[PDB]
Amino acid sequence: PHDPSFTPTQLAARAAYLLRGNDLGTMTTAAPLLYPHMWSWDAAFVAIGLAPLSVERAVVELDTLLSAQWRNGMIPHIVFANGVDGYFPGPARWATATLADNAPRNRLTSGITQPPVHAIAVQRILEHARTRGRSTRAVAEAFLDRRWGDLMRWHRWLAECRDRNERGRITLYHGWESGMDNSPRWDSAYANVVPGKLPEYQRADNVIITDPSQRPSDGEYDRYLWLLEEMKAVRYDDERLPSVMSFQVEDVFFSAIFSVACQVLAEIGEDYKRPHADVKDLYLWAERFRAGVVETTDQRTGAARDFDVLAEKWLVTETAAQFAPLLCGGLPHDRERALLKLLEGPRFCGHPDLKYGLIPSTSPVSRDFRPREYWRGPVWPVLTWLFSWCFARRGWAERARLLRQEGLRQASDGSFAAYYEPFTGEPLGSMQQSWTAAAVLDWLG
Amino acid sequence: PHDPSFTPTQLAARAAYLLRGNDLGTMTTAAPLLYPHMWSWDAAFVAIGLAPLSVERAVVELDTLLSAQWRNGMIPHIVFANGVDGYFPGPARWATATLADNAPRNRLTSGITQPPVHAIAVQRILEHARTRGRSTRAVAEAFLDRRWGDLMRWHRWLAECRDRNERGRITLYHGWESGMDNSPRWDSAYANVVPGKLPEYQRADNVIITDPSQRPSDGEYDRYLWLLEEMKAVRYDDERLPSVMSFQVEDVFFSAIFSVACQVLAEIGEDYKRPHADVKDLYLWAERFRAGVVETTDQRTGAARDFDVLAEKWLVTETAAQFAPLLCGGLPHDRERALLKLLEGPRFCGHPDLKYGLIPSTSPVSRDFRPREYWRGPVWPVLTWLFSWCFARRGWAERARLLRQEGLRQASDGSFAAYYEPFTGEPLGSMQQSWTAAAVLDWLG
Amino acid sequence: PHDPSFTPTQLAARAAYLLRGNDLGTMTTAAPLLYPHMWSWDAAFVAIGLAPLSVERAVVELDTLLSAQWRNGMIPHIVFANGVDGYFPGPARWATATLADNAPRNRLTSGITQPPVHAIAVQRILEHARTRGRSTRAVAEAFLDRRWGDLMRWHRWLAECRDRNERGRITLYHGWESGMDNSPRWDSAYANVVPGKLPEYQRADNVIITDPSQRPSDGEYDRYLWLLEEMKAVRYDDERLPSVMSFQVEDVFFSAIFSVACQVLAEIGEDYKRPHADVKDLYLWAERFRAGVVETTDQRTGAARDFDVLAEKWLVTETAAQFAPLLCGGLPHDRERALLKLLEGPRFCGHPDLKYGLIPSTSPVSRDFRPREYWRGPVWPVLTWLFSWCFARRGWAERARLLRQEGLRQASDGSFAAYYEPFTGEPLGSMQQSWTAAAVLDWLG
Amino acid sequence: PHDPSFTPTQLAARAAYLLRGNDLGTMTTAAPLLYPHMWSWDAAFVAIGLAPLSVERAVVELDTLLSAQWRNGMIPHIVFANGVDGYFPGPARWATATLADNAPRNRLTSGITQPPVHAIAVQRILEHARTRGRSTRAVAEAFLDRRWGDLMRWHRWLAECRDRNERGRITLYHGWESGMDNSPRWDSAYANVVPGKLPEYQRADNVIITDPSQRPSDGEYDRYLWLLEEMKAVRYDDERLPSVMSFQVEDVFFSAIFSVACQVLAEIGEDYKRPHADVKDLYLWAERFRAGVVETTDQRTGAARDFDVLAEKWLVTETAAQFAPLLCGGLPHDRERALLKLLEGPRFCGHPDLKYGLIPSTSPVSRDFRPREYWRGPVWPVLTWLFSWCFARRGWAERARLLRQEGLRQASDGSFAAYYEPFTGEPLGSMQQSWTAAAVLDWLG
């Protein structure tokens, strides 16, 4: 009535209840109906959220994701649960089981990737396990033994197959691989995607989320599915993709996350006495991608830019991805201060009409801003979590705390939505999103 | 390491995670392996624990229990889950599906009852629902519409078939119906139970809990199962039980709980405009059983006594059941003060060697005291919860708070055991007991 | 910026800081500039707020107040601080030092009384002290040893000198004795006060609080100050007041507080082995003022009425004092349900325009309602505290909890105002009021 | 009885109460009787603890200290309260009023300095003020307007007059300037101090703290007081101290604090548009003292060493000051990992007999260890605070969190002692120390 908000203990109870309720056994769905399968970076956040509840079950979540790793090392962005429809495109549309020589043996997966936040999840699992004493340390350490090789292959595939020219930036062949499907970041590269004879299909996402203003448009889905056809024609071969894909972009946010991930995994590798050549490689990649992100930045404002490889041009947009260099470090001192002024100013977290001091996915003063439409404007708790966690790693303890405080205040209604209207705070999209529950559990401690 | 305790937010997350993890779908198991079925007063506590998480799912728990209600109104103490063994005695041993004319149609149940804390669970569901606004009120109110008649039949069967002589005390035909299976309260009535040709059996409880000191003895289980044979020979007929049962005791704690339950249900009946004749009946029974409890009490100390109907004599023991009149009210002023001095003194919560200021199931200075052996000594969070909740109803706000505080401190290790060693605090019995998680969730708010 | 509220630990620290900052040494000012002396029922609340900080200093607050008790047992409503100016009427205007035979020696006080919340403060000090160990328990028990007799004289003076006809209601000779200076309760009685030659004077209160809408009018002060002249003319003699005072009312809210206080003090006397004759007297007065309160009640709603002794007529007004019977008990069951419906419904706590679910001092739908004007409408935390504490004592734990919760939400701006606009929540009157900080400290525990 | 600890809100309220109770008006005593004056780095911590209570009063604390700054820029380590006795050496013994050309007018102070934590307090005040709205931000920014120049003079006096050879390490002329009076760090330097005709005196400190084991010896005080004679003989002249002082050491912990403070103050100067030349100087000193600290470090463990300027030899001792490089950064990566292993391992935080996971002032396995004797072993909350705050600044959020958490667990008895027995946790020295209450308030947020 007068106050729909939950106390911190009630909120944490409700978050954990949701995470257990989305558990199919060995995998957690990203959202009950909209996303009834295991998604890659959702799964990393799910492991973070499970680590305060059960280190064993947190490890099981990453074990399950890594059992779907491709033979070349790629972690695919969807691992389908057996016998669940209601999500399109499903395994039949991707047909990776048929066409992809590198697809895993006893798992149905997608044929594209997603950002490598997994090392961050490993770090949080270990930190939790170190507070719970010997028996629980052993579980976390036995996981390292079993899966260090697989994490290395994941990072090595990113470093070697998606950074072919050693530019220190990750090439994507689908906007879906960025995690920000309809970000304004990809508008001009999608504008050069002309579909051919695209086999018939029926959207399923917008039977669940029926507001047209909160999901991508039909025109946008026709480009998304057409790119799948181009990958399928080359049997998802890494070598042939540069030659065929109509969409090839260097994703500076994905690159900054990879840089952080390598640094984190390198430190884990040192503390647990993993092979020295692996630690050296991880430190090498963290520096290469840190430098690769810095090379994209505006020399005045520090804002990071994506790069359209096909058009051979810098993509200038006003989204939250501009702040990638804040995550990984590396900017000159003056350029970083300017970048923090942009973050805190009226074009983003300082905008006067925002309900919370949180980072909007697109700047509200940008011509591309749409307050309800997914990544074109709404506020995402997963960005809040990622920025706050990276900010604290930079030593910016008070910036990290303020983002955490406002994220808890936004989440304190218990909707656990993936994104929120930035002016009114209305939950948008699907409720019961596992990784919002995870972020809340991590923040509450 | 230095401190295995969880923060209040971590504890509440872990409690809710456990409650969701014990959910089979429509019922919650009392404990994963030891009690892999739905138990009656555990189920009431489970509903209390679920009400802060989901009023819908809390209502579903009570709906499921009430679907197993017998045709005469009795709520049986076990509702078996389909296809689960590992618990003895199971449905085949009870054979209620064959023999009991009143057994429910499409449910396997036991053939005995357990204390009526269910109205208390209904009260907590309603109080939660009133803080969550219109949609959630409707769910709680629609439950009242569907199940008020069934709750009335439950209370009426207790009042009419287990208080045949209108003495205002509940007769039990099995120590299991008290919830305190091996309490010293029943030793002398069990001593007059001589088993006959008792069909062969194998205990299953002590394959799971293998410490012999924490479960009842083999000699005690032979009496428990022999009483089942006596009920089976009369096909669980209410009319014939007084004529055949070797164990017939008036349980003063069960009676005090019934008195409170009637009072609570009567107030619910008034606030939601249920039939006036039902409210009148409930108030009648609450007073009759309040008086029935007071009639058992020592005129000096106020301690309540059980009554062995067969031996026709008062049972004097030093267990927590002595404090039944504190729950329901009714004692003269001086007698109640004396009873509170007994509770707070060195024979119970004031005993110098107790780790927490909590109520031991048997007095530590009693000859019957056994520090590890189930109801002969250990501390049970479910008694802590019940006393604290009833104390606050009496207006004893600070006594209730102190019991709550110490219960949270004991539970703060996250074992969620049903009972604890009273001197060392060691968790005993089964971990992951649903109703300890429920008590914690209720207390934390 | 985005969130003006403090966290619970920040709020608690700011409340304790305010209380120590208003400490003059052995007495706490009620407010820094508006009320720069010790007020009697503020000092009871200050004692409650000091108890979690220092039992020694809480006892000192009450010792200081009781050292200013009159020879006939009356506790005056102001104890003036040595040398302090800026409040009118000051010691010069009261002239109790010269005129009042019963006034204390070497303490300057006023010449009227105020409600007897003091036993409640004594209970909260004892409950705090029992959690703190032996030396702290000794401090509290030595305070009882030396002031029990003074507390009895206080209650005996009320029962014998302000209830001379043993009606079980307290007569007041000044609206300031009710604690609700300008309440609509007193308007018709004040209409019969006709000042004669009133010696001139300048207000001090509205030089500090200069908004005219938040304090009484000049016309009201003329009547307040004339009643002082009438008392002085008979040198504050108890026996002469009924024959000379133009204001003589029975205060049912004061009477219900006294009923509760007698019962509280009686229970203390039993627990700490005080003279049996004293405890009997206290229980006798508890019951008599309970009956006196209930005798006033509306036959349909159970609402309590004040009584004008000179006019011999019931005073019907729509203020929070109507709910007096909820505090002390005594209504038949159906009338108490009606009275709680009145409290929770749209004339009081459930009015739709109210920011908080709290009790306005006057009904927002009464024609006497004024949203800014002191006791004519604003929400007072002291009343929130009293009802919540009294409701918990009645055993209405959820109702007490909801009041506490809204009270803390209102106070979380750290204003510590004594009253608040009911619709906007704007803090009114003086900031830095000790008894609001005290309420907050008691609630946060 | 069963649980001596306070809840977080009770702890916070008791800390704020202590801080206001030690407030003399415009300065806070360090301790009520032991240290009844303003100490310089306590006053920085007091300012940190006041910031969540009152930004205005926090600023006043720093204004009062800076009004006692010497004409050459030095902040003296004691500012004496007008008319206050009971601490020796008092203003008479220092005689700075008569002898010291640079001493302030109309403030009595000591004649030595103390570590420069003050910029850290300024940062915490600014961070608090930015969360509180415009008028509060104006208070903090007006404080910078009027004291920025004084803060620069402070840092410039340290860099130019106590680092005359631009070695990037601060020279001390008295162990009291380190803040660690009787630390084993200084024993070999104090062995070269040979008192001549020392004017007689009586200790005041051990009349308050009478256990001989918790304070320095008479022999140590004879040396402390002789160094005062040497300073007075040259009238506290900076230029003459190197030629006459028998104690001259480079304090690496002080130097690392100064490095951090310069960098903090430089960032403030950038954010608030202070003169660019000032910010350049601050970053220059930050780097120079960082390098000076690292130059001292053990080549295997990275542990920092103090330097005895008269003996020209590195001082190797096993105290917490060895961890200075963790505060300011600068170690190569592999040496910092070794130093953190030393900190967390069995010689310091991981010693098995330690009650809390906190940093003992001397290693429990060193032969200089004494568990009760001031800086020779006990655990100090101020060090816990400094390392946690500095660790968070390095980006080691989990390490900073674990220190905070153990610090709060140690403080939860409400003793507010300045140091604690490391094995039993017994509070030692004076209770009611302001800077421990300050630490607690900052941690609880």
Author numbering:
A (entry chain B), B (entry chain B), C (entry chain A), D (entry chain A): 2 to 446
Can I see the authors' text?
A glucosylglycerate hydrolase (GgH) identified in M. hassiacum and found to be highly conserved among rapidly growing mycobacteria is likely to be responsible for the rapid mobilization of GG accumulated during nitrogen starvation by hydrolysing it to glucose and glycerate. The MhGgH monomer displays an (α/α)6-barrel domain typical of glycoside hydrolase family 63 (GH63), to which MhGgH belongs. While the active site of GH63 members acting on larger substrates is located in an open, solvent-accessible cleft, those of MhGgH and of MgH from T. thermophilus are covered by a cap domain (subdivided into A′- and B′-regions) with constrained access through a narrow negatively charged tunnel. The crystallographic structure of MhGgH revealed a homotetrameric architecture, which is compatible with the oligomeric organization of the enzyme in solution as assessed by SAXS.
